[PDB]
Design a binder for these strands. Sequence first.
RNA 1: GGUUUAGAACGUCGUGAGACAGUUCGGUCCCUAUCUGCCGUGGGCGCUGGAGAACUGAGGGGGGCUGCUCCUAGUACGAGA
Length: 393
Amino acid sequence: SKEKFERTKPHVNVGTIGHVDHGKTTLTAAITTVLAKTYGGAARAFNQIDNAPEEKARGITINTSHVEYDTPTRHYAHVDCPGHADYVKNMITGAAQMDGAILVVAATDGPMPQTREHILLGRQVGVPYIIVFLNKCDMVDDEELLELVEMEVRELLSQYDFPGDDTPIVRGSALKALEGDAEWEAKILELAGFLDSYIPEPERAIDKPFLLPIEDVFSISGRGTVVTGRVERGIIKVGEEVEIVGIKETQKSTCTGVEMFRKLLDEGRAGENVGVLLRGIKREEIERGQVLAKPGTIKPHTKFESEVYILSKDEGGRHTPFFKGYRPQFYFRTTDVTGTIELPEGVEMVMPGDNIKMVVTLIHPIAMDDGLRFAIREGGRTVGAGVVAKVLS
RNA sequence: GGUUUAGAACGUCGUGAGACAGUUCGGUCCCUAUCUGCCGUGGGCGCUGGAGAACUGAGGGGGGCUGCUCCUAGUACGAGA
Ligand SMILES: Nc1nc2c(ncn2[C@@H]2O[C@H](COP(=O)(O)OP(=O)(O)NP(=O)(O)O)[C@@H](O)[C@H]2O)c(=O)[nH]1
Ligand SMILES: [Mg+2]
Ligand SMILES: [Mg+2]
Ligand SMILES: [Mg+2]
Ligand SMILES: [Mg+2]
Ligand SMILES: [Mg+2]
Ligand SMILES: [Mg+2]
Ligand SMILES: [Mg+2]
Ligand SMILES: [Mg+2]
Ligand SMILES: [Mg+2]
Ligand SMILES: [Mg+2]
Ligand SMILES: [Mg+2]
Ligand SMILES: [Mg+2]
Ligand SMILES: [Mg+2]
Ligand SMILES: [Mg+2]
Ligand SMILES: [Mg+2]
Ligand SMILES: [Mg+2]
Ligand SMILES: [Mg+2]
Ligand SMILES: [Mg+2]
Ligand SMILES: [Mg+2]
Ligand SMILES: [Mg+2]
Ligand SMILES: [Mg+2]
Ligand SMILES: [Mg+2]
Ligand SMILES: [Mg+2]
Ligand SMILES: [Mg+2]
Ligand SMILES: [Mg+2]
Ligand SMILES: [Mg+2]
Ligand SMILES: [Mg+2]
Ligand SMILES: [Mg+2]
């Protein structure tokens, strides 16, 4: 909080995806040290990508850590997702804001059960583009074995509905590029080139009014309570009226400073992760899931009609019917929420792999409008995608 | 210290003397080692002229415990932990 962030180069939200203990967080650390050395950005280290007691005694990552590496063309903003099956909830918030992912499959183990689950969540939420990275390579010195894994990833993406063969696969060790090997340093400089070439300039919405889903809340010692997240649409000027909408009720507020990776800003534009400082609000009363909207634009609702597309055994979801009373998790912009289902008159049961509409009464009210996309989940797996039809409350 | 003498008391049984793995407080533990054994340490003669050294080894004894950390490797194993 001192240096002013100069608005140059387009902003892009990137993040690593993949199996547990597969080189996902280590890739993030490899991208910093490579890009910082040659081009001349800020250095950083593997340290702080994940500190705490939880991510040291174990070694695993829980929190979605962020990184800011810069290149001549564009200014990237990383989102290193956790990895585990148990940490899928806080991952989806990191994955929703992420524009273009970096998948991490390993040459030794290959595509594992979570790799299938992570890419499954990427499609239904909103991950337009994806890039593969083989994160072991050196451990198995062979030409035939390493190339057989590349075939299975191309099959995985094409089976689950992506381009597959068009996606640029890259090979390279993360640990070898951490130190200073000339052949392996240049091979991850190549990944930065694939990030620029494949993923296009993202289409923002700098016209329709201000909205910002809160991914994680903070309490800065001195300044006040702060909320982070990607600005979904519109802009934010300093000293402007902002209404916080979502869970509990609704509160008036005013912005008193927006920032971008510990650097000041005047205008917080759309499609970029920013930390908004709020005036006269406590850490407890504001929570994760709520949205920073401009007053009057959006209203919180606890009941709505919605066209739900349930999945089958083949697509990956439920395989049995269910009657009114069923309570799955509904993942809107960031947070999840439970709700009872009231089916329409003339529909006795809901079979798997079927398009229908239904009334859903949620326990917590969330801010929503007509034409909002969500992904239903229940029992550590997906259920179905859909869209909102009508407001009731 | 306990049990198991002589003092005294409580509860209990007994008319009473007294009694009770019922309880309670107090209450002398001797022996210079002949033999066997054992740990040490010598004198005698023997071993075939005597003497001084240096070995050999039959045989005997002693010694044999194990933690943690770190690499191999967060590798096999495992959906993950
Ligand atoms: N030899 C070698 N080891 C690697 C390479 N990349 C990653 N690893 C190893 O893979 C392990 C996993 O590290 P990390 O990336 O933090 O795990 P993750 O992929 O983020 N998943 P999670 O954080 O949920 O546990 C580490 O022990 C690391 O040494 C590589 O290129 N070569
Ligand atoms: Mg492993
Ligand atoms: Mg990780
Ligand atoms: Mg393995
Ligand atoms: Mg006594
Ligand atoms: Mg006695
Ligand atoms: Mg007496
Ligand atoms: Mg007696
Ligand atoms: Mg008694
Ligand atoms: Mg006395
Ligand atoms: Mg005495
Ligand atoms: Mg005495
Ligand atoms: Mg004497
Ligand atoms: Mg003897
Ligand atoms: Mg002797
Ligand atoms: Mg002799
Ligand atoms: Mg003699
Ligand atoms: Mg003689
Ligand atoms: Mg002799
Ligand atoms: Mg002779
Ligand atoms: Mg002789
Ligand atoms: Mg002699
Ligand atoms: Mg000798
Ligand atoms: Mg000798
Ligand atoms: Mg012995
Ligand atoms: Mg180790
Ligand atoms: Mg582990
Ligand atoms: Mg290893
Ligand atoms: Mg297996």
